[PDB]
Every structure is written in structure tokens, then in C-alpha cells.
Design a protein around this ligand. Sequence first.
Ligand SMILES: [Mg+2]
Ligand SMILES: [Mg+2]
Lengths: 238, 57, 49, 119
Amino acid sequence: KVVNLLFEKRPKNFGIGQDIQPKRDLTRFVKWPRYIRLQRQRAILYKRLKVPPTINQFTQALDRQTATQLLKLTHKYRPETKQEKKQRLLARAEKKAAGKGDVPTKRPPVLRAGVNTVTTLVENKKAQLVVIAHDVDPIELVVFLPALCRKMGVPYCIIKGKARLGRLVHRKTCTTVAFTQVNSEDKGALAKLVEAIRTNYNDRYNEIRRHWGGNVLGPKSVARITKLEKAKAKELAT
Amino acid sequence: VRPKVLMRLSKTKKHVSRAYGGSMCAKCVRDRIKRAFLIEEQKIVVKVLKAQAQSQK
Amino acid sequence: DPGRGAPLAKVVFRDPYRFKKRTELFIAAEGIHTGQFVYCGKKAQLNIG
Amino acid sequence: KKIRTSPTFRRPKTLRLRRQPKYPRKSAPRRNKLDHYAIIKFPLTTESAMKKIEDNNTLVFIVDVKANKHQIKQAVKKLYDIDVAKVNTLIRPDGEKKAYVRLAPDYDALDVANKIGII
RNA sequence: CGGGGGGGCGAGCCCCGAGGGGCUCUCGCUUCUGGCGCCAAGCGCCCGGCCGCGCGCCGGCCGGGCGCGACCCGCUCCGGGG
RNA sequence: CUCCGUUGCCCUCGGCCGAUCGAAAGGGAGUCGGGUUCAGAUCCCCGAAUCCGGAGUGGCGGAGAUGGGCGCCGCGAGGCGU
Ligand SMILES: [Mg+2]
Ligand SMILES: [Mg+2]
């Protein structure tokens, strides 16, 4: 027997009033500070109340398949980083005084970031695709944009993350983004995203404008109200 | 003797060499021994009466 | 306690979460004596205290 | 998955560094002002002080009111090349701090009194 | 806590092949005595060093780590109002 | 840079309960006898003490501890090996 007879068991039993209880997770019983307790039951009021459609369209969003292509298309068009803008001017100050620089050169097509840059060139019918982040903090800034879009016949999409959309342009956040022109070779992928988007967003407004997005109770409550509908069912179903 | 004096005194002046010595009175120690006995023993007795009540049923 | 006609009772449970001994002050029901076992809760049985 | 065993949320213990001043806040250190020549004002020559000298082997001093017994000992030791057994301070009415300084047994007070000019 | 699901001594009912399974309940196990009660056992799975067999996820010596034990998911900390 | 100290960071543990003030009669370790001045003395001097803190390197002894067994060698006190 390779077992020393002394190793016995001493198994504990945590019944009520029995041996002391051990430590389990309690994340659902913790006195969280007044800023966590705030931001969690902010995301609840955002489900319990009856949400207006224009704020609600920003909940339904793009998917893993569509958004990854968009975020791939933009990686060929990111506006010049700093120290990347430096060599666009510096190379033109040396090319001008040495090798026949007229300096009008064709500014290669790039994105456009801000709201009051995009809403000008959508009001102008000058944008192929508009990308909207769904989590802008004052939603006032983008509440209108989707309706302004489809009224001008411009395909708009709603992607997730004002951060990763504000990561193509080199900033922290960025609410919108827009392709005005595209390279001729990149035209195939641009026309492919476009039709796949406006089938889901632009040609849908009479389903979006008439869609309220809350009025769901908490599951502690749904389990109670539906438990009285198995009583009322089994009262006149048996 | 006044409590802050117990710092000067020696270990044997402050206790008496037994179980619970210097804190319990040895008339309540010799009870806490033969009370901690039969509490366990009649937990064994209920353990086998519970093991025979489930062996019968 | 002063200012009250009822006597209080220091009843010692033991906290079933941390090794310690919670002690309370129940308004003593008539019949309670020292050394009695006071049981509490839903599954307790119906007798004095 | 670091489970929360206690139901309280005590704030996490953040790192905090030390002061790394780009400049000193004041330029130079304030030169010390309780020196060995400003801690001893002048020795008393009272008839009840000389009677203290020859008999008790002490010396009576008037001493700046901010002085410790350790401070008084390290100055009397620094000036008169002396060594001190124990220092006894008081505060006269009029607020000047007397200090009876008991010299070690090997040292004579009736002699060091002549060096400091009192008698 | 609310749902769920585990468990099962056991009871009601349903099914059953008498092995068992499903629904319902019970429980979350402590009531004779002025006792003791925590900082984990046990099991499992790994890894570091050392020794031995040497094929070393073999076996020994020394030293650690994670999982079960201590069921899973959640959206208001739990109750009482409105 | 032995070993110890110090500090930096990482893991681990920690309920409180209120920043702080409030008694020269409450709580609060430990000083007594003799002598001394013109005026001070449990405060100076002499002689006996005493508490608290430090005592690291530990200042010194004492305690922890100095057995028993077996095996030899020795007349024996005893010595060695395990
Ligand atoms: Mg004794
Ligand atoms: Mg105070």
C-alpha cells in the first residue's frame, strides 16, 4: 500500500448552522461605488424605458463580416499621420527647387472624419459611404445623420466603436467617417459594400422610423409574470 | 495586582499550568472536558441511529 | 437597562460566515433563563424565546 | 476571474511616487541660529550661585529660552572644554532660562569659573 | 436573490421493464446537556528543480501551480411601498 | 553584498466606526529616608531604590540539555563507532 494510513478525509459540510461557510464569488452582492452603480443602471434604463426610433437605430449595427471589410478598406486611406505629413511638404520643398515642381499634385483620396465635415459633403451629394459610430456620448451629434443620408440617396452604415473608428484617423474617438472618392482598383470592393449596406439600412427606413426599442422587463420580473401564465394556462388547458 | 504591572511579572505568576490555566476555574474546565465528551459521543449515537433509520427504510 | 421596565438578554450566536461570535440584546421573553438555547429563523420550533 | 470574496469594494492601492523637484523651493538653508554662542548668554555670579559653585560643583548659567537640556550640555561642553554630569533648567520670572550645570567628579568648578572670568 | 439546472435520504402524483425514468414536494442536511468549529482536507490535473529506473506526462526525493470539493446563467444589493 | 539591514515592485492578509479636541479632583507603569537655604526642595546634596524604552553585533552566566539504547574497547572508573 503506497498510502500512509494517516491521510484520512476530514470532509466539511456547509449546511445552515453547520461548519463555517467558505468563500464564493459575490460580484452580485457587492457595494459598488456610486459611479459603477450609476453606469450599470444607466444601461438598464436604456432597456426598461420605451426608446425612440432615432436613438434606437443606433443599437442595431453592422456584423463581424461586413465591418471587417470596411475596416480593411479604410486601411488604404488613413489620413496622413504626423511625421507622415512632414515628408509630404518636405519632399515638395526639395522637388520644387530641383526637379520642376509645379506642386499641384493629385491629393490621393482619403477619409473624412468630423461631423460638420461629413454633413456638409452629404448635403452636397459628395460621399459614397458614411460610417457612423453607435456610442457617441451626446447622441444629439448623430441623431439626425441617418435621415439626412437616405434623403440624399447616400448609403450609410452603423459600425460599433467610436474608438476603433477613431483609430483609422489617428485620434482617440471619431463619430463618423466617409469615402468621397476611391482609387480605381479599390472601386470593386467599394461598390460591393455599398449594395450590401443600403439593402440593410437605406431601403429600410419605414421599418426603422416605426420601431421602438425598449419596454422589456427585467428577467427577475419576466420569470414572475410568465409563471402566472403557466397557472392561467393550466387552469383552462387541462 | 493593577493591570499594567502584569508587564513586569513573570510567566508563572500570571497563569497556572493546566489546560485553560489562568483563564478558567478548573471546576468549569473539568466540566468542559466531560461535556465535550458526550456531545461527541451522542453525535456518534445519532449517527448510527440515523444510519440504521436509513438502513431500515 | 435603566429607563426600561423590561430586562434585556445578551444572546450569543456565532457568525456563520467568519470565525467570530456575534452578540445581541433581545428583549427577554418571560421564562427565558440563563443557559437556555434560543433558536432563530424559519425552521425554528414554536416555544418560548 | 479574480473572484470577490468580500462584499465591500475597498479602493485599490495605487502607486504613488516621491517628490522630484525641478528647483529647490527656497535657495539656501536657513543658517542655524541656536548656536554655541547664542545658547549661552552669560553665567550668573549671584552670592547664591557662587555658594552653588564651590559646594555642589555646578555652574549657574543664563541660557536662551529655546534651549534643550541636551543642547545646553553640548554647548557648555563645546566652549569651556568641560564635561557635564547632568543639567537642571528652570525659567526665572522675567523669562530668562537659568541652567544649573553639574560638572563630572573629575572636573572642578572653582577652577573653570576663573577661566570664564566669574568669581 | 430570481430563474434554472445538480444531488438525493424521502413523500404525493405521472410513467415504468421493477432496472429505472419524468412531474410535484422536501431539502439544501444543525433541537436533551453554560462543549468545540476559521486560515481545507480529500481527490483530480498539471509544471519547476533533484534522484532513481531510463522511453520519460515510469517510479522515488524536494518544491510549486490550477480545477472539483464549494452546481450553471443573469439586469435592478437585498426586502416593503409606487 | 557573508548575512543582515534598507528600500522598489509583484502576490498574500487586514471588519469597524470615525478627521481631531475634551479631566493640574475621573482613567493613567515608576522615589523613598536623611541632610541643606535668607528664599527652593519626594526637584539641590548624600544614601538607598525603581519604572519604561533601547541592548543590534547579543554584554555575561543560567535555562532550552545533555539522556537512553545498541555495538565494541577498558580489571574498573571509563573511551570510541553507530
Ligand atoms: Mg503561580
Ligand atoms: Mg486629549
